[PDB]
Design a protein around this ligand. Structure first.
Ligand code: DCF
Ligand code: DCF
Ligand code: NAG
Ligand code: NAG
Ligand code: NAG
Ligand code: NAG
Ligand code: NAG
Ligand code: NAG
Ligand code: NAG
Ligand code: NAG
Ligand code: ZN
Ligand code: ZN
Lengths: 497, 497
């Protein structure tokens, strides 16, 4: 008889469950006594919310649309703890989508020579023109200063601007109830801001706001996708990508010199995957040059924009292989968005295969990865971190209930993962705290606590592209931040005995 | 590494080919006729996927069954799957596996059938041969009278159907949460409980299960049944052994009539809301029926909603009782387990106990992909997972069926059988709708006839037939399969490649 007694049964059961706990993300962490006190409180809070949903038969709010869950999570102890927690790094961000829309309204649209119009789809668009109103090509441009002053209600005018630009004004899952409907709205958001946010002094100040906001959410380091290209002055001068990179380099240096508690930033060049291969070839050659001449600030290349209907990595393969085929070879690093799809066995999810054959340093999203066991092997063996952006994946149509997020089985296998926010400005998320909350509450289990948070945070520095000296310094800084957070949390939540 | 495109293509195809060989059906070698049919299926599959992807419209096979049912039935892939022999349906409930239309057109035209509207405004049906039923909570009326007085009998019969089916409206819209749709699902069983437990109706309904499944080219079924409490017009209530004997006689006569049909076996089910002392008695009952009806009575299962009710651990001394006897008794178990979006809770840990208790198959296993060690045990022991895709969508585990958690199981060749669960409740066919959505949503664009053939063979090879019965059933299946291949080549004009 295998289990003659309860003790024989529970011994076997606990060993099996415990063996899976050791295998998941953070499973090898041993919390010290202070960490255990905070962990016990977190786990009591997590069990309370889950058991109420389960036994009282009501929806699990951490997993519903961010439009509904945002205000609810923010009043809770687990959220407040994650808010205070050092996040380490945000490794997957876009430079025109990572600061507050409120700043675009309150700062950028109060500058001289800013114009607005309503397009044929009934969305506001903003731009800058130093030579009077722009040509009225399908849009009647009006000076924002004049429109605001004549609105009859300035605060309502500014609120309307924000409401017309944000994807969280209504619930995207209701208003745009399909992948291509919500991607139409997402694409529209960037068209709305494209004019104003590519004006050079506004772009410079918006990037600085990214750094300020991320530091304020206790993020010490960022790596940012940027097109780098087309920043324009009041007189119409258009700058080249190298200038855009130098501009970001100077903003970053000033910021780190001001704030020694912040590790810094590095940049990935991005190009939209709607362009012809001749354009991508030029951008790959550009990236080769910037990688050689700006090492340790310029990281490499990525292809962005909607993955399902547009060009595959294989569609660009001659350009993407070109650096490795040079004599001598040049190893241009790649950070491909890849597998951001519900499709299986198609050209889209097979981008994951090409991303690994091209030696990607990290993979963006990887939502389809759990359907690809041989790709998982390569991701684990090579230490290619998957950048998991849970709010983005829900709002942009990959999943509804976040407990169905395809990264949960990756985390259970200890696939290397970093959490990031992607485009937090677009849908009014915080730099990291909202995404870290949904990952913690939806993508791991009821009995997964502070060890999971600690591992994800450390992962974001370990799988950053900092060099050895930078990374050693950043990890010492993170450890100091972590110790302060543990001590502060015990006092705040009255857990010291 | 890739000086030319040939070397790049070879590594790409090696990796992709490795995954195709690993997944369900990857080792099958199709003969030349099967290859012709496979080529047409794959051409059809790519055409629908490419249209959704490139023309940016929703992928109908993956939307609510309420929307997709009428759309899929006109397509060649569905028609091929309809003609295809399915082998076996291994996960079925005996009060939910024949048409509601038969309940209306046959059962409610029998003498002594009564109806009432309950406090939630749903029709309930029952039989009373000893006067009208007592008006406890609702006012019972003779259906014969209500129908004759309706002034539109067609509309009256259609109203009965509409008031009982869960597909009258889209359950994802009308009952938009787990516990709302489970409320509706529970209500369905209450609506029919009285009438479907009347012995002659219960006998004839079970016969209709076999007729309908045979008509959908299913040759064998294993069915969950409570067995107990069938009642006569004079009020006699029968015991579980009588119920089992009734089904056995129906099955034997059905197989006599239709030698092209392999037959049926029965699993005793009990709802997991009862006290442990009652489950103990049902285990003892099952031990006795297993001993005295070997080869017709299979074992035991716990059913009803998994999340808010009793866990397997909550019954563990009852479930361990057979193994603890002197000499031990191995009562086979078929647990519904892991039918949940929860992780790290008592609900998904039912999967651990199902393995420790030596379950022969696991029902649903939706949470299994979150449990890497349980996956390896399921694979090494050959414990088939009964995957019920329409059920899991309608009953609230997933919205887009491409996020179904069995897709990553199939990609690793976890042993899986497709079944329909409760096809009569929501107007599905015995197997063809579930096999279509499995084929279109749970495997990839490049997965063809080999996946279908493997799933069909799996349903016999992981059935509870003994080895001799399996050989006989596979001979019959092979003959059906060969006829299906030849017929399909003629029907779809494929004979000349
Ligand atoms: O100007 C920014 C560019 O980046 C795209 N972009 C911004 N966020 C994402 C993008 N692209 C792909 N996947 C979804 C998400 O991760 C939009 C635009 O082309
Ligand atoms: O009388 C039939 C019983 O079976 C349950 N039942 C029927 N179908 C299912 C059930 N239980 C659990 N999971 C969903 C699905 O697989 C309902 C009722 O208690
Ligand atoms: C269910 O809700 C009630 C209040 O409505 C509360 O008393 C009880 O604790 C809840 N149960 C759980 C397990 O949260
Ligand atoms: C906008 O930001 C700039 C740069 O930080 C600052 O100088 C300017 O005063 C701001 N505008 C307003 C209205 O605060
Ligand atoms: C944007 O503003 C216009 C004009 O007020 C309004 O009609 C439209 O609904 C708004 N769109 C969104 C998405 O808020
Ligand atoms: C990828 O990296 C491997 C290991 O360093 C190297 O040998 C190979 O040439 C690289 N391939 C490409 C295409 O860059
Ligand atoms: C998209 O639709 C058009 C007709 O509207 C059709 O001709 C075309 O082939 C479709 N594209 C695909 C890839 O199916
Ligand atoms: C109902 O089924 C029974 C048994 O199969 C049959 O005798 C009877 O004719 C049927 N009733 C109707 C109305 O078809
Ligand atoms: C059932 O019938 C009643 C009475 O006609 C009707 O009001 C109710 O909406 C129906 N319910 C469903 C779920 O169809
Ligand atoms: C499970 O099966 C194994 C192998 O047949 C057997 O040794 C063991 O006793 C069984 N365990 C239980 C709990 O029935
Ligand atoms: Zn992105
Ligand atoms: Zn079931």
């Amino acid at each position: 008889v295998r289990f003659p007694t309860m003790d024989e049964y529970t011994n076997a059961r606990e060993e099996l469950i415990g063996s899976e706990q050791y295998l998941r993300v953070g499973g090898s962490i041993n919390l010290n006594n202070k960490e255990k006190k905070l962990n016990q409180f977190i786990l009591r809070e997590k069990r309370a919310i889950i058991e109420n949903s389960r036994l009282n038969k009501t929806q699990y709010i951490p997993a519903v649309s961010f439009f509904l869950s945002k205000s609810q999570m923010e009043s809770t102890p687990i959220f407040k703890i994650i808010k205070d927690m050092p996040k380490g790094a945000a490794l997957h961000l876009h430079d025109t989508a990572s600061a507050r829309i409120d700043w675009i309204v309150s700062n950028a649209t109060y500058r001289d020579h800013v114009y607005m119009c309503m397009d044929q789809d009934n969305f506001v668009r903003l731009t800058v023109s130093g030579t009077g109103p722009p040509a009225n090509s399908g849009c009647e441009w009006k000076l924002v200063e004049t429109e605001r002053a004549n609105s009859g209600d300035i605060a309502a005018f500014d609120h309307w601007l924000k409401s017309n630009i944000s994807l969280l004004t209504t619930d995207p899952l209701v208003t745009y109830p399909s992948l291509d409907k919500v991607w139409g709205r997402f694409d529209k958001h960037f068209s709305q801001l494209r004019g104003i946010i590519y004006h050079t002094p506004i772009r410079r100040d918006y990037y600085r706001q990214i750094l300020e906001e991320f530091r304020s959410d206790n993020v010490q380091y960022v790596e940012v996708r940027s097109s780098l290209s087309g920043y324009y002055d009041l007189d119409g001068t258009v700058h080249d990508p190298e200038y855009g990179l130098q501009l970001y380099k100077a903003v970053t240096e000033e910021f780190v010199r001001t704030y020694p508690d912040f590790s810094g930033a590095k940049i990935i060049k991005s190009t939209a995957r709607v362009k012809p291969n001749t354009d991508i070839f030029n951008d790959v050659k550009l990236s080769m040059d910037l990688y050689k001449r700006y090492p340790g600030f310029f990281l490499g290349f990525d292809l962005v924009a909607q993955e399902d209907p547009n060009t595959s990595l294989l569609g660009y393969i001659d350009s993407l292989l070109y650096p490795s085929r040079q004599n001598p070879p040049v190893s241009l690093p790649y950070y491909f968005h890849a597998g951001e799809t519900n499709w299986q066995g198609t050209e889209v999810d097979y981008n994951l295969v090409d991303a690994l054959l091209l030696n990607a340093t990290r993979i963006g999203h990887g939502f389809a990865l759990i359907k690809h066991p041989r790709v998982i092997e390569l991701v684990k063996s090579r230490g290619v971190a998957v950048e998991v952006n849970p709010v983005s994946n829900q709002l942009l149509g990959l999943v509804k209930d976040l407990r169905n997020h395809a990264a949960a089985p990756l985390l259970a296998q200890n696939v290397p993962v970093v959490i990031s926010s992607d485009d937090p400005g677009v849908w009014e998320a915080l730099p990291m705290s909202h995404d870290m909350y949904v990952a913690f509450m939806d993508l791991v289990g009821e009995d997964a606590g502070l060890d999971v948070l600690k591992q994800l945070v450390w992962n974001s520095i370990q799988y950053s592209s900092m060099n050895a000296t930078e990374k050693k310094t950043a990890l010492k800084l993170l450890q100091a931040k972590w110790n302060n957070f543990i001590n502060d949390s015990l006092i705040k939540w009255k857990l010291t005995n």
